[model samples]
Target: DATSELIDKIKNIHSMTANFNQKLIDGQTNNNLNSKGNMSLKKPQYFKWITTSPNNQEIVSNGTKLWIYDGDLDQLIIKKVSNDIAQFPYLILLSKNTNNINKLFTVTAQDNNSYILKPKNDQMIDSIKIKFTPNNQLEYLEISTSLNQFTKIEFNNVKTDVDISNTSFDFKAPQNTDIIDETKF
Candidate 1:
């Protein structure tokens, strides 16, 4: 029931923007990392994640193609939208299908607030837990990988269903950036 409710809420959202803080823990090296950013998401197709801390970085998707422009590396990755995120845990969110998610994940609600979603695939990230406010504003998300890595994100100042133009998802590679096309072989 919760998964269906979550799906319905996602379907209703046409556009959203939020400020976020993130933490990542490296399993092998035991390193802890932190970053802060802003995220913009549009239903059925688009999202832009921009990190403004330590450095500027971006990941953008426009339904079919995904783009990553890592400012520190001066690199750009252009790839198909699907599964390119298998290595990136955030695949469970953004530019995805509700039916597909429901098919792949088993959801359980905890304490009436947090919801846990475990993937049916053993090789996928172990599980994801999300916390939402009673009014349905997403507040936090935690992902645990099969490799034992962990990532936590906390969102603040969320605004949903605002008017977002088509130009919002458009991307252009920066000058002198190394472009990698993963769309091809």
Candidate 2:
């Protein structure tokens, strides 16, 4: 009930693509490292995350398999995925099932557009925070780690529910690129 209520507040969102700016902070030195890029996600699971600053790279998933491509080395690493989007705040915006949130985390609704989630005993995240616009648009996500460092990601020019080509989620490594399969590892 609460989950659906949470969903209702957001604009009939099933997928989202946006230009993003991320702030990765050093816990002790107060050093701020930032990057900007674009990301898109389709639920029940599909996402393409590209970082285009300093280093160009990609982390993509077609729901069943995940791929990481390192541009500098021209290598592609492939592996099977065994988890949902609950652990990451970015893809969590496209989450279609509230049961996933309820089963594994303690969810607290700060208001109509804000939620604070902490991992249950068996999980790995320290905490995940979500803040949305008054109109139910996602504004920012902050992930706090055990080391006391936090990564803050903010979205801009977000587009949702529009037609997106399925090919956007597919990946083709450049020719002569090294490929590694870690599925059995």
Candidate 3:
């Protein structure tokens, strides 16, 4: 029920922004101790996650499209939003007002303040758990996958009910680079 409540709160949210830090671990080998990053999100489909230390990478999604910019390889990958709605978490924020939450995820209340979710189909990742502050804002996220790895993310500077641009999700490739359209998958 807490998960449903959280989903409801997030569904009603029009926009949001925040900073994040991530730590990753390889469950099998117990390697890759930690990685950190900063992330921001706007409701109804917009997110920007940038790795700030160890390496630089960015993943951004506007309501209709998604782009991953890998600074190390100078490559930009693009995907249409409609093509992968089932595989992305933020898309739930956009469709929640209409969809049945019970149909998509196995929602469980972790505590008075948190909920854990595991996708029914188990596609790209295995499981994801989200923790919320008492005020019902997202505080942290934990993701575990079949790859025997786990990632934990913490958010800071979270701001809600702000105006965000429609173009925030569009991605234009830089000059002299390859633009791979991967939405077909």
Candidate 4:
């Protein structure tokens, strides 16, 4: 079942590193495009997603704060440690204990070794479904939203327990770019 498979996968993952390919589709225009990136995550709320194709962009969470940098625009967006978006994904990643998992997500098993997880927050995105290999490696992630839009992320060359840098999450914005603060909302 999906519950058992999800439990097994989460239980076994302490940390992970992988290459990610994200394909974005415009529903109105029917245009499809993709970007390639690298992602690294460690237990207890640390992650770095670096995009290397189409343009350079990065999203990093350093256990305290979240930083989003767009190299093409030379801009940086920063938020506090208590930011909900940063907290949400980290909480899921750190949910190793079975009891915690049950409290946080509604898990449903799907055919072909996949599982769908719905977070407790109704105001947020709708669902996140993950597919896995028999060896417990994540193959793909499909994120569905209440707005009838969805995104898929595929992983390749995933590795675990690799040395990553703490400085990777730091960001500095360019001098003349406009900085918008959305933290109040």
The sequence of per-residue lDDT tens digits that candidate 2 reaches over residues 1-185 is 54556656442577888988999998788899988888887766678889888678899888777899998889999988656555555556656567777777777778657877787854446888878898788788888877778999999999987667777777888999999989765
Model 1: weakest 10-residue lDDT segment is 83-92
Please give, for residues 1-185, the per-residue lDDT of candidate 4 as tens digits.
45566766766776789999988765656678789999888765677889999999988777666778888987777776652432364455545555655565688987777887887856456788788886778789877766555778899999987766666555556687566544446
**Can you write out model 1's per-residue Cα lDDT over 72-166, one digit (the tens) per residue?**
99999898877433345455555235666666778787785787888776575788887878787778889898777899999999999788987
Candidate 2, superposed: residue stretches over 4 Å from native? 1-4, 9-11, 28-30
For each candidate in turn, the TM-score is: 0.88, 0.87, 0.84, 0.80
Cα-based lDDT for every prediction: 0.79, 0.77, 0.71, 0.72
Superior candidate under lDDT, 1 versus 3: 1
Give candidate 3 regions above 4 Å deviation.
Answer: 83-86, 93-95, 98-100, 183-185
Clash count, predicted structure 3 = 1
Q: What TM-score does prediction 4 earn?
A: 0.80
lDDT of 4 at 99: 67
Instruction: Estimate candidate 3's alpha-carbon lDDT, on a 0 to 1 scale.
Output: 0.71
Task: Tell me which of candidates 1 and 4 scores higher on TM-score.
Answer: 1
lDDT of 3 at 68: 86
On TM-score, the candidate that comes out on top is 1
